[PDB]
């Protein structure tokens, strides 16, 4: 049913090790942050910071 | 003392990105180590 | 541009008191300070984006304003004691987030209705 | 150790489509990899395709590209070979060949490039 | 496609001494050729596979060995059944546009 579409390819071997990634907000929005440690999921956090 | 688990370097894998299955090349000649940290675990409770 | 958010902790009427006092490595260096001129040029053009919508409700320049236009009730009714010493902004921002199209459609036209004042 | 079994002898007329099959018997057919090569008469070994049947995918000579399609059903365990366009020099001997390549099922393979278990060898013959 | 030229092409050597087969590789093929042996009736046999791994249930006696663009494959002692056609196939290149070798010519030494 399907259609299988091979996208057959070359598939050369390289180095691949993962490196830290900061992702930010640009030209007018502001990323929150909980900094309280014991977290729940959802509800509140009275220790809130903007990055 | 150390708990060890046996597995392959499997080739047929299936894309997490999307419904796939790709296939890639066989495993290189050499030593192949990672020395990593575990923090974390996925879960989930039991049917009935 | 956005450094005027420390006060959201505080109350309706601290901020209300609090708004009229104020509203290679070199490489590494440019990349980045640009991405602080583009927040600055947005600052001022978003700041010359509502200021002249201010000017349709008739105030400008002005950090506290109001307009001939009475309050209805249906706008979550509560005393104004209450909501002004023990009240967060973000709270009123939740009660009242679906009429603020109701407000700002409204202003303007009470706007208009004392311009027909001056336009006789 | 594991035997395939190719289709007889056919005869057709050019311009018509021939289709040949390879039925591999002995282990798990879909654990394979499936090679068809084709021998001229006095002449080497010419390649003219490769299938992979765990992932249903084929690969053709490119001077050869467009009259040939090599399909496998697992099923009946058995690989097809179609050609379009038969035309008299194209006389030859038709050749299944497989590969054994890892656990495939599970995810492992090995995608090996020679040929080991080979076919008895069908003759096809396209002249008046 | 892709072609495949040998200098010199053959050399005659009469039967009934060690002789050694070299397979040339227009491009750079590491260790991806493969020996096949036709004794003419019948279906190509694998000997040599990875340019130098031995194939299951053959003799040791042949040897192969080589990389890039030179390989050759070397017999102890001929046979009787060691005198086929020998065809020498790489398969490095991907996707698989596979070609296979031309074979040796060994002439009747009829007089
Ligand atoms: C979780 O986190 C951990 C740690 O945070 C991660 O673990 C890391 O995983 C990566 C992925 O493999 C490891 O990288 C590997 O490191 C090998 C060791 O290299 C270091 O030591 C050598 C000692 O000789 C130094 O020379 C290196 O420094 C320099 O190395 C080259 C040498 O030319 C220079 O050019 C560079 O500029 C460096 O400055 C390192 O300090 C390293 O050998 C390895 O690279 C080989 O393997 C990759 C794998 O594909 C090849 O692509 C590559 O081309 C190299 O190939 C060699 O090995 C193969 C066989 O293995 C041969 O066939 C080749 O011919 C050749 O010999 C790679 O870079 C990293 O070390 C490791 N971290 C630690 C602390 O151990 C986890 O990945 C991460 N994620 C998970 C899921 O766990
Ligand atoms: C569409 C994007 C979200 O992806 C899913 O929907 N996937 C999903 C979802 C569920 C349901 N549980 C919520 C179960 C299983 C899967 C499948 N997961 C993986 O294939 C997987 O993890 N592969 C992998 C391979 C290599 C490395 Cl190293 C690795 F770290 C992981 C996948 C479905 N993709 C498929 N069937 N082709
Ligand atoms: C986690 O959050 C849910 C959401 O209300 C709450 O019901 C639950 O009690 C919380 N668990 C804790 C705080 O351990
Ligand atoms: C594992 O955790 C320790 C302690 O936090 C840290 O020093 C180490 O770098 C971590 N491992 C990796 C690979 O980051
Ligand atoms: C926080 O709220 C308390 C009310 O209990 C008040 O006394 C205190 O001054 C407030 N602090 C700030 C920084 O707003
Ligand atoms: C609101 O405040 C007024 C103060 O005049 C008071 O009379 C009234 O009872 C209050 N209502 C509620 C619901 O708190
Ligand atoms: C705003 O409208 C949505 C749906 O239109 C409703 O769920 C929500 O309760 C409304 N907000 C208030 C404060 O009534």
Redesign the interface.
Known sequence: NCN?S?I??????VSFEPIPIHYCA???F?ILKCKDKKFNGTGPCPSVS?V | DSITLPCRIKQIINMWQRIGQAM??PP?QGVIRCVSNITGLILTRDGG | ??GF?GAAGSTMGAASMTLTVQAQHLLKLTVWGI?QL??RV??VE?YLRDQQLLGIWGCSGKLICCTNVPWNSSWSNRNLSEIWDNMTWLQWDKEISNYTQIIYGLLEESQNQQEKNEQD | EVQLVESGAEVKKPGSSVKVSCKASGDTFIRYSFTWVRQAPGQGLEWMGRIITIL??A?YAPHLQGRVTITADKSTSTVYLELRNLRSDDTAVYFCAGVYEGEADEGEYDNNGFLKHWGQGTLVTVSS | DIVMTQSPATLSVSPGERATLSCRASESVSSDLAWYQQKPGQAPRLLIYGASTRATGVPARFSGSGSGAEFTLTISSLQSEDFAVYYCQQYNN??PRYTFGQGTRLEIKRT
């Open positions: 299988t091979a057959t390819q070359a598939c050369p071997k640009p030209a007018g502001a903007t | 890639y090349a290189i | 541009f956005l958010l991405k583009q927040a947005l600052a978003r | 249903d995918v690969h | 991907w996707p």
